[PDB]
Amino acid sequence: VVQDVKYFQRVKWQYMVLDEAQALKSSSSVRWKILLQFQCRNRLLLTG
DNA sequence: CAATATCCCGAGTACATGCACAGGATGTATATATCTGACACGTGCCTGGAGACTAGGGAGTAATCCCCTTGGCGGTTAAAACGCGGGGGACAGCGCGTACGTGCGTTTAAGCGGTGCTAGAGCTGTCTACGACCAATTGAGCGGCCTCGGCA
């Protein structure tokens, strides 16, 4: 998802389930910077 | 405007060329010749046509920055022109090779009969090479942990 961004930007996803979202913990990360830009109703984090 | 240069015209200039000549070797001229291959005849093949279908490619577009393109760059010599050196240029002869002629004799072409080499045969009869797929490796980029320099 941090590479095929161009393809994911092509469609209006209803929701993102970001499983084990502790992966996103640092704002310095490209992952975080890019994952902010996708458009959806809800962003759902399932991180224990 | 001045200057070096190219252009242009007439005098005077060896020999080059076009010609006439003798004469020799070859192009002609006739008769003969078989055989090349022209021509005629079928043989059988591929060149072509004609269909159905996928999938590969081709064409198109979109985004864009690489590369080309341009300007302006700063740096150094080919050109210009002269001075200046020796070297390319024009005659005397030797004899050695080249030609050419003679008689040098080696080999080829031809026609002979015999015969084994090669080149079209196979499904030969496989199985190298041809896909098909799998697996390893390196490299690169992205997270993550950790000392230290400049700032409160």
mmCIF file of C-alpha atoms (C1' of nucleotides) in Angstrom:
data_model
loop_
_atom_site.group_PDB
_atom_site.id
_atom_site.type_symbol
_atom_site.label_atom_id
_atom_site.label_comp_id
_atom_site.label_asym_id
_atom_site.label_seq_id
_atom_site.Cartn_x
_atom_site.Cartn_y
_atom_site.Cartn_z
ATOM 1 C CA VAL A 1 0.000 0.000 0.000
ATOM 2 C CA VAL A 2 3.004 2.349 0.504
ATOM 3 C CA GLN A 3 4.014 1.637 -3.165
ATOM 4 C CA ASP A 4 0.836 0.962 -5.239
ATOM 5 C CA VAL A 5 -0.583 4.323 -3.986
ATOM 6 C CA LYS A 6 -1.494 5.373 -7.569
ATOM 7 C CA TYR A 7 -3.833 2.356 -7.901
ATOM 8 C CA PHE A 8 -5.405 2.771 -4.451
ATOM 9 C CA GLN A 9 -6.051 6.503 -5.216
ATOM 10 C CA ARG A 10 -8.143 5.449 -8.265
ATOM 11 C CA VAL A 11 -11.177 4.192 -6.229
ATOM 12 C CA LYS A 12 -13.357 5.609 -3.397
ATOM 13 C CA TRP A 13 -12.933 2.988 -0.639
ATOM 14 C CA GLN A 14 -15.783 3.036 1.891
ATOM 15 C CA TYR A 15 -13.595 2.199 4.949
ATOM 16 C CA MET A 16 -10.002 1.318 5.880
ATOM 17 C CA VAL A 17 -9.326 -1.384 8.478
ATOM 18 C CA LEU A 18 -5.728 -0.732 9.504
ATOM 19 C CA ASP A 19 -5.008 -4.026 11.254
ATOM 20 C CA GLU A 20 -2.358 -4.012 14.031
ATOM 21 C CA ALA A 21 -2.110 -0.217 13.593
ATOM 22 C CA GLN A 22 0.772 -0.030 16.120
ATOM 23 C CA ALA A 23 2.697 -0.255 12.791
ATOM 24 C CA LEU A 24 1.733 3.444 12.191
ATOM 25 C CA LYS A 25 3.107 4.716 15.536
ATOM 26 C CA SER A 26 5.709 7.221 14.105
ATOM 27 C CA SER A 27 4.631 10.360 12.147
ATOM 28 C CA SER A 28 8.152 10.608 10.654
ATOM 29 C CA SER A 29 7.295 7.414 8.728
ATOM 30 C CA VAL A 30 6.461 7.461 5.029
ATOM 31 C CA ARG A 31 3.800 4.877 5.912
ATOM 32 C CA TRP A 32 2.067 7.409 8.182
ATOM 33 C CA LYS A 33 2.544 10.366 5.776
ATOM 34 C CA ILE A 34 1.028 8.443 2.850
ATOM 35 C CA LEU A 35 -1.754 6.550 4.696
ATOM 36 C CA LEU A 36 -3.177 9.962 5.815
ATOM 37 C CA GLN A 37 -4.142 10.811 2.203
ATOM 38 C CA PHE A 38 -6.643 8.016 1.359
ATOM 39 C CA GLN A 39 -10.318 9.096 1.495
ATOM 40 C CA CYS A 40 -13.004 7.036 3.305
ATOM 41 C CA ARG A 41 -15.924 7.286 5.808
ATOM 42 C CA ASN A 42 -14.085 5.645 8.729
ATOM 43 C CA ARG A 43 -10.524 4.639 9.631
ATOM 44 C CA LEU A 44 -10.678 1.629 12.004
ATOM 45 C CA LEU A 45 -7.668 0.576 14.131
ATOM 46 C CA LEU A 46 -7.682 -2.941 15.683
ATOM 47 C CA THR A 47 -4.361 -2.703 17.586
ATOM 48 C CA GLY A 48 -4.092 -4.466 20.961
ATOM 49 C "C1'" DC B 1 39.228 55.927 -50.226
ATOM 50 C "C1'" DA B 2 43.891 52.686 -51.076
ATOM 51 C "C1'" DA B 3 45.801 48.829 -51.908
ATOM 52 C "C1'" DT B 4 46.590 43.924 -53.303
ATOM 53 C "C1'" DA B 5 44.678 41.043 -56.235
ATOM 54 C "C1'" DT B 6 42.145 38.736 -60.261
ATOM 55 C "C1'" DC B 7 40.888 39.356 -64.880
ATOM 56 C "C1'" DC B 8 41.881 40.204 -69.692
ATOM 57 C "C1'" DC B 9 44.159 40.967 -74.122
ATOM 58 C "C1'" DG B 10 47.919 40.667 -77.607
ATOM 59 C "C1'" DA B 11 53.133 38.810 -79.047
ATOM 60 C "C1'" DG B 12 55.741 35.535 -79.453
ATOM 61 C "C1'" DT B 13 56.349 30.549 -78.857
ATOM 62 C "C1'" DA B 14 57.832 24.373 -79.946
ATOM 63 C "C1'" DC B 15 55.870 20.822 -80.994
ATOM 64 C "C1'" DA B 16 51.466 17.850 -81.441
ATOM 65 C "C1'" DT B 17 48.541 16.632 -84.170
ATOM 66 C "C1'" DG B 18 46.594 15.409 -87.779
ATOM 67 C "C1'" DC B 19 47.859 13.647 -91.975
ATOM 68 C "C1'" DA B 20 50.005 10.728 -95.894
ATOM 69 C "C1'" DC B 21 52.524 6.506 -96.657
ATOM 70 C "C1'" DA B 22 54.138 1.433 -96.935
ATOM 71 C "C1'" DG B 23 52.744 -2.954 -95.915
ATOM 72 C "C1'" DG B 24 51.273 -6.865 -93.125
ATOM 73 C "C1'" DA B 25 48.179 -9.871 -90.555
ATOM 74 C "C1'" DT B 26 43.583 -10.781 -90.179
ATOM 75 C "C1'" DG B 27 38.809 -10.214 -91.305
ATOM 76 C "C1'" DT B 28 36.389 -11.869 -94.829
ATOM 77 C "C1'" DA B 29 34.175 -15.532 -97.687
ATOM 78 C "C1'" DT B 30 32.460 -20.256 -98.822
ATOM 79 C "C1'" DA B 31 31.562 -24.773 -97.653
ATOM 80 C "C1'" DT B 32 30.783 -27.989 -94.067
ATOM 81 C "C1'" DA B 33 28.981 -29.283 -89.385
ATOM 82 C "C1'" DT B 34 26.781 -31.247 -85.507
ATOM 83 C "C1'" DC B 35 24.685 -30.237 -82.157
ATOM 84 C "C1'" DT B 36 22.878 -26.667 -78.831
ATOM 85 C "C1'" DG B 37 18.966 -26.079 -77.344
ATOM 86 C "C1'" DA B 38 14.424 -24.524 -79.339
ATOM 87 C "C1'" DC B 39 10.421 -26.234 -79.104
ATOM 88 C "C1'" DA B 40 7.353 -28.878 -78.297
ATOM 89 C "C1'" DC B 41 5.124 -32.007 -75.052
ATOM 90 C "C1'" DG B 42 3.118 -33.355 -70.638
ATOM 91 C "C1'" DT B 43 4.030 -33.776 -64.662
ATOM 92 C "C1'" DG B 44 2.990 -32.587 -60.491
ATOM 93 C "C1'" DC B 45 3.768 -28.651 -56.826
ATOM 94 C "C1'" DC B 46 3.389 -24.706 -54.692
ATOM 95 C "C1'" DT B 47 2.030 -20.502 -55.116
ATOM 96 C "C1'" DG B 48 -1.867 -19.041 -54.068
ATOM 97 C "C1'" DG B 49 -6.138 -18.664 -52.336
ATOM 98 C "C1'" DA B 50 -9.656 -18.457 -48.506
ATOM 99 C "C1'" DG B 51 -11.578 -19.088 -42.954
ATOM 100 C "C1'" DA B 52 -11.697 -18.971 -38.010
ATOM 101 C "C1'" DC B 53 -9.585 -17.629 -34.112
ATOM 102 C "C1'" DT B 54 -6.871 -15.995 -30.497
ATOM 103 C "C1'" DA B 55 -3.322 -12.946 -28.328
ATOM 104 C "C1'" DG B 56 0.322 -9.848 -29.432
ATOM 105 C "C1'" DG B 57 1.066 -5.956 -30.873
ATOM 106 C "C1'" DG B 58 -0.027 -1.571 -32.201
ATOM 107 C "C1'" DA B 59 -1.988 2.734 -31.482
ATOM 108 C "C1'" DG B 60 -3.434 5.817 -28.556
ATOM 109 C "C1'" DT B 61 -2.977 8.868 -24.580
ATOM 110 C "C1'" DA B 62 -0.933 11.360 -20.303
ATOM 111 C "C1'" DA B 63 2.450 13.257 -17.699
ATOM 112 C "C1'" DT B 64 6.913 15.232 -17.723
ATOM 113 C "C1'" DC B 65 12.012 16.753 -17.542
ATOM 114 C "C1'" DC B 66 15.724 14.964 -20.055
ATOM 115 C "C1'" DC B 67 18.127 16.280 -23.301
ATOM 116 C "C1'" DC B 68 18.538 19.285 -26.436
ATOM 117 C "C1'" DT B 69 19.162 23.832 -27.309
ATOM 118 C "C1'" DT B 70 20.947 28.623 -26.612
ATOM 119 C "C1'" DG B 71 23.599 32.308 -24.791
ATOM 120 C "C1'" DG B 72 27.197 33.831 -23.040
ATOM 121 C "C1'" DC B 73 31.202 32.188 -21.412
ATOM 122 C "C1'" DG B 74 36.906 32.637 -21.020
ATOM 123 C "C1'" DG B 75 41.186 30.889 -23.251
ATOM 124 C "C1'" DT B 76 44.305 29.916 -26.752
ATOM 125 C "C1'" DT B 77 45.869 29.051 -31.071
ATOM 126 C "C1'" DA B 78 45.853 28.499 -37.058
ATOM 127 C "C1'" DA B 79 46.394 32.217 -39.883
ATOM 128 C "C1'" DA B 80 49.197 36.194 -41.723
ATOM 129 C "C1'" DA B 81 53.210 37.685 -43.176
ATOM 130 C "C1'" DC B 82 57.650 37.901 -43.125
ATOM 131 C "C1'" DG B 83 62.203 36.554 -43.064
ATOM 132 C "C1'" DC B 84 65.331 32.727 -44.455
ATOM 133 C "C1'" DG B 85 67.691 27.257 -46.003
ATOM 134 C "C1'" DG B 86 68.381 24.002 -48.463
ATOM 135 C "C1'" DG B 87 66.543 21.218 -51.766
ATOM 136 C "C1'" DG B 88 63.897 19.909 -55.858
ATOM 137 C "C1'" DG B 89 65.320 20.775 -60.501
ATOM 138 C "C1'" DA B 90 67.943 20.232 -65.311
ATOM 139 C "C1'" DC B 91 72.100 17.206 -67.844
ATOM 140 C "C1'" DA B 92 76.184 13.477 -69.135
ATOM 141 C "C1'" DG B 93 76.476 7.914 -69.399
ATOM 142 C "C1'" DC B 94 76.247 1.710 -68.057
ATOM 143 C "C1'" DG B 95 74.607 -2.114 -68.485
ATOM 144 C "C1'" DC B 96 71.424 -4.675 -66.817
ATOM 145 C "C1'" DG B 97 66.582 -6.720 -68.014
ATOM 146 C "C1'" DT B 98 63.288 -7.265 -70.966
ATOM 147 C "C1'" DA B 99 62.138 -8.773 -74.720
ATOM 148 C "C1'" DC B 100 62.148 -12.249 -78.259
ATOM 149 C "C1'" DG B 101 63.531 -16.092 -80.792
ATOM 150 C "C1'" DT B 102 64.835 -21.309 -80.665
ATOM 151 C "C1'" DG B 103 64.096 -25.342 -79.664
ATOM 152 C "C1'" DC B 104 63.259 -26.588 -75.831
ATOM 153 C "C1'" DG B 105 59.777 -32.042 -74.386
ATOM 154 C "C1'" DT B 106 55.637 -31.963 -69.880
ATOM 155 C "C1'" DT B 107 51.430 -32.551 -69.653
ATOM 156 C "C1'" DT B 108 46.344 -32.504 -70.882
ATOM 157 C "C1'" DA B 109 42.484 -33.845 -73.304
ATOM 158 C "C1'" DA B 110 40.124 -37.606 -75.153
ATOM 159 C "C1'" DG B 111 38.296 -41.710 -75.511
ATOM 160 C "C1'" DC B 112 38.733 -46.107 -73.497
ATOM 161 C "C1'" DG B 113 36.049 -49.730 -69.487
ATOM 162 C "C1'" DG B 114 35.334 -50.591 -65.009
ATOM 163 C "C1'" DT B 115 33.115 -49.631 -60.149
ATOM 164 C "C1'" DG B 116 32.452 -47.588 -55.766
ATOM 165 C "C1'" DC B 117 31.366 -42.977 -53.831
ATOM 166 C "C1'" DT B 118 27.617 -40.062 -52.812
ATOM 167 C "C1'" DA B 119 23.519 -38.529 -52.254
ATOM 168 C "C1'" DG B 120 18.608 -39.266 -51.824
ATOM 169 C "C1'" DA B 121 16.081 -42.342 -49.702
ATOM 170 C "C1'" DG B 122 13.672 -43.734 -43.940
ATOM 171 C "C1'" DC B 123 9.911 -42.803 -39.918
ATOM 172 C "C1'" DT B 124 15.100 -44.341 -39.789
ATOM 173 C "C1'" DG B 125 15.071 -43.621 -34.174
ATOM 174 C "C1'" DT B 126 15.495 -41.066 -30.744
ATOM 175 C "C1'" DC B 127 16.793 -37.057 -27.439
ATOM 176 C "C1'" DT B 128 19.681 -32.238 -27.867
ATOM 177 C "C1'" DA B 129 17.661 -28.595 -27.314
ATOM 178 C "C1'" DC B 130 13.379 -26.305 -26.097
ATOM 179 C "C1'" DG B 131 10.351 -24.507 -23.397
ATOM 180 C "C1'" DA B 132 8.471 -24.558 -18.282
ATOM 181 C "C1'" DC B 133 8.923 -24.102 -14.218
ATOM 182 C "C1'" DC B 134 11.337 -23.665 -9.768
ATOM 183 C "C1'" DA B 135 14.720 -21.716 -6.659
ATOM 184 C "C1'" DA B 136 19.002 -18.124 -4.922
ATOM 185 C "C1'" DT B 137 21.094 -14.202 -4.759
ATOM 186 C "C1'" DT B 138 22.154 -9.624 -4.434
ATOM 187 C "C1'" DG B 139 20.780 -4.957 -3.635
ATOM 188 C "C1'" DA B 140 18.005 -1.202 -2.149
ATOM 189 C "C1'" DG B 141 14.998 1.171 0.685
ATOM 190 C "C1'" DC B 142 12.297 1.673 5.287
ATOM 191 C "C1'" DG B 143 11.807 0.762 9.976
ATOM 192 C "C1'" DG B 144 13.850 0.922 14.193
ATOM 193 C "C1'" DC B 145 17.091 1.012 18.199
ATOM 194 C "C1'" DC B 146 21.070 4.080 19.981
ATOM 195 C "C1'" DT B 147 25.906 9.940 21.039
ATOM 196 C "C1'" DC B 148 26.454 14.071 20.535
ATOM 197 C "C1'" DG B 149 26.125 19.910 19.318
ATOM 198 C "C1'" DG B 150 23.912 23.769 19.417
ATOM 199 C "C1'" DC B 151 20.294 26.242 22.405
ATOM 200 C "C1'" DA B 152 17.262 27.599 27.339
#
